[model samples]
Target chain A: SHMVNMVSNPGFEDGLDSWQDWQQDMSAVPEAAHNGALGLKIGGGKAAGGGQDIPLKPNTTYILGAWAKFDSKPAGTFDVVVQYHLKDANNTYVQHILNFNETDWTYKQLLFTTPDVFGSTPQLALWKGDTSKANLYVDDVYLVEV
Target chain B: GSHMVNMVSNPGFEDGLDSWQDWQQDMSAVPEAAHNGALGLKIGGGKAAGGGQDIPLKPNTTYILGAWAKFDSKPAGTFDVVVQYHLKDANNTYVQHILNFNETDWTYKQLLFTTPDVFGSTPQLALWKGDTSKANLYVDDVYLVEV
Candidate 1:
């Protein structure tokens, strides 16, 4: 099936102009990009990331990934997460995750399906895995129906 | 009356102290001044007074935000009540609306506004006195609701 990538500013080239920062103990920053003018960093946080709800086709699976590296070798790990927000204001979600423990640049990927029951919107996010492992560099995020 | 429950937690300060976080550095729920209750939020202690809480909301929607304000010593400088929110980005950008109550008494302050399209899901409800203002501004019944 021919499907367009659903993520906006997927390359981090627009300096966080399209992403939403989930605030609590984390922050999203626009910095140098892997191949563009800007990239997003989990500059400071305890398990933080940037997210935005994308329209979804229920019961369909999608592939998502991002390129990331740690500021230095992490003591723990980093997480790449996908969350589905049910539009009914029910505060329900289905989670998909991938974890990495190395510091070098690598592409992390995962496949997640919209629940069979039904959900109106789905969100993709780049997440930090630990409360103390602070520095995470991220670039080139993508989500596409396959 | 089918009054919707208050958008602000502890709108009555009946919990004594819960669901409220301080933004002005030093603040507390006090018993000294209240519009219609035994306790209210007291801001000011020889310092600039202000604090707020974050509320869940939808973008591009209009909301009525308000609060009751009473000054302990009558503001000597500037005193205002503000409703505000920030952009969830690297810039830490913000947008706010203010009601300037140049004089102090038991006053009902309010603002009718539409939440910004770029506004975060959580909008901050804040109240403050001017930096040089020297007085205790007591606040109560703070609210933000979709209109």
Candidate 2:
């Protein structure tokens, strides 16, 4: 029952080697980590910060967990979104919004069960609201089967 | 060495207070004091103000109860993280874990407990402020997971 974390460079200890950045806004910084020596800092913008594509099993339950904080109090919202393709040519996204205005690091988790689909690869991203101006820090990102 | 999975729904109050119930009718999902995600459960300043969820658990199973908690301001009393389990013979057992005497910064609190040897046991997770503390309690990332 030992589940492996499916994310590469999950804690950003190896920097952003396995992640794709958006608008060049994501950086690995040591000053804002949650539990390790490095964490991801995403600059404020209206774009997806960064993410990785993870292959998932159909009809299997998986959990996504991460620790996040704000450099300053944010005026707008932040979101963690997972996008995947369905059986047909359509795609969908599941998102969890972060609305807390505090700067303390907070833990968030999302449980998802993948539906029947071909090549169920989920791309997880941290999206910043257009009006949010504070930099966001993220660490300990995990995706595991239940 | 099983991988732990959270059994609590809406653990971070991201979807409001949908899967939780306010015991003292003083709990609200607030965005000002979240430990993670957009909102945290805010229990008003009163000794009886609290909220929780009732979970159906496997008998004789060990579960770790974890939560992040803090006070809006320094309070004079203790904050409690509790599990109340109902037995088969119409009896109940209570396990109380004191989170902190007075904490202003967000802190993680946890406790491990094993279910009794009985089926159909339901354990309820409750957060309470002891000794009439008037400071509002903020809680988030509440979870009950098997080890």
Candidate 3:
């Protein structure tokens, strides 16, 4: 079956208009991209990241992937996480996708299935692990049904 | 299209860790950390302590493994949900999914894993704390399901 990327502004070509930033110095910088002209640069605390709420089909399997690179040697981890309402409360699924000190653009992917009854729209996020002052640049985020 | 079923027994730890096996010491069913039921699995820090259960799997099938976990005290570490299986006349293999958390609240963690053509019946769903972890982990609602 043919698949499509369900993310809006997947490469940050339109800046951070469609994404929600959380306690981060989030910017669409040209120098931090993996492809295209711009990428999302996130810096700040451990809780610093960006997310987008997407309408996904229930009980369907989807694959999420991204290209990320650290501006320098990072002291903590970087993860791709999804938060969705399963029963009554918000549940999170996290993938620790980045290496410790890698400066190259690393690609990682995770597959997840939605619950039968969704509590709310699913939120896909990129999160920094700790309160280190390191900056992470993410680009080309995609979510597609397989 | 086929329907899925939760193949795990006592997934919520409500039966006091029944149908579960601890990999090392310091695993218990504590009442204070339930995510939904009356009890949850607790693994004390600083050791390789974890728990699992053996479950058979169909060849070339896809399954989803998940758990709700949080730390008693937030530690600068991580945890893994692993599926251990082996092929005939081959070494033991593991499909480990890592979750790095800085939150103390209950967070749902899951991963999708597909078995090989020659899957083993000795597949075990296990949760292990990171090697240098320093906080007690509370886990609940462990599930392994074919989808």
Candidate 4:
């Protein structure tokens, strides 16, 4: 899978354009596991949908990861999952990975790549599912396409 | 702040002034932010989420609306809400305006609106729900003031 930035992706053929103007709000973090951090961070309450998406390559090997933190004990942990597609018919490629629980003030990383794309034009999405834990802060989103 | 004219449990949803006959006030609860005109709202709680607030208003005044509350419950349903400002002149009564929301964070629903006039001596704010069984909603920041 490949990563596309909204600032750089002008066409916005994929929904990843919305994340280009990323707001690293309240404990939300964003990194590439390069310098020293894990991935990226995304914060704000549940009412606020604070997260991002990117485009995917036809055939590639990508690794993504990020660290998370939460002030109070959320109802549950962050179920960081990856959603991809080849053409946008249905969520054909849906891979769920229970990354980690966000309850501390420390940064965490969400790591993964794309193994399948359901069918649309082929894209990627990093979703933080579950409202049990409302205040979600994500940091360091890693992705290397080969 | 707080609403002086209220008729429910813990009209001021905080400080343990008077919780509802059902649940007590949770001191750890904090007031969330909303739009303007929501300054006079005290802490409010109800057995249902889509419960409405009935407040009277003044005609032709640049009044502001406000609301604040928090919740930790989620019921499986979709409901719309509006803070209805009603006006009753000498003869007829009508709903002036309604602030509507397709999907709401019932656990923590905050809203504000300016009251309007139609016909009568009583212009009021009524917390209304277009959908029923919308879950029990709790409110706190409830007030109206001159802008």
Which 10 successive residues of model 1 chain B have the least lDDT summed?
A: B1-10
TM-score of candidate 4 against the unseen true structure: 0.31
Error of 2 at B56 (Å): 26
**Which of the CAPRI classes, incorrect, acceptable, medium or high, describes model 3?**
incorrect
Error of model 1, residue B62, in angstroms: 1.3
RMSD of each: 19.4, 15.5, 12.7, 20.1
lDDT of each: 0.65, 0.72, 0.72, 0.38
Provide the interface RMSD of candidate 2 in angstroms, 1 decimal place: 7.8
Q: Which candidate number would show the highest TM-score if scored against the true structure?
A: 2
Clashes of each: 0, 2, 0, 75
DockQ, every prediction = 0.01, 0.05, 0.03, 0.01
Q: Residues B1-147, candidate 2, lDDT per residue (tens digit)?
A: 124578888888888889888777888898976876788888888675677778778777666666778888888876777777656665554444344536898766565566778843567777776646678888887767763
Candidate 4's fnat? 0.00
Q: B16, model 3: CA deviation in Å?
A: 0.6
TM-score of 1: 0.45
- Cα-based lDDT at residue A9, candidate 1: 77
lDDT of 4 at A27: 30
Two-way lDDT contest, 2 vs 4, winner: 2
Model 1 lDDT tens row, A12-126 = 6666767887654333355435645667777543666667777767656566666777776676677767776554558576678878765777766666666665554566766
lDDT value, residue A117 of candidate 1: 55
DockQ of 2: 0.05
Question: Model 2: per-residue lDDT, tens digit, A1-146?
Answer: 13457787888899998999877888999976875699888887454467788777787666667777878878765666667767665655444433434588877666667787744567777776635678888887776664
The order by descending lDDT is: 3, 2, 1, 4
Instruction: Please tell me which model should have the higher lDDT, number 1 or number 3.
Output: 3
Worst 10 residues of 2 chain B by lDDT: B92-101
The residue-level lDDT of candidate 3 at A49 comes to 76
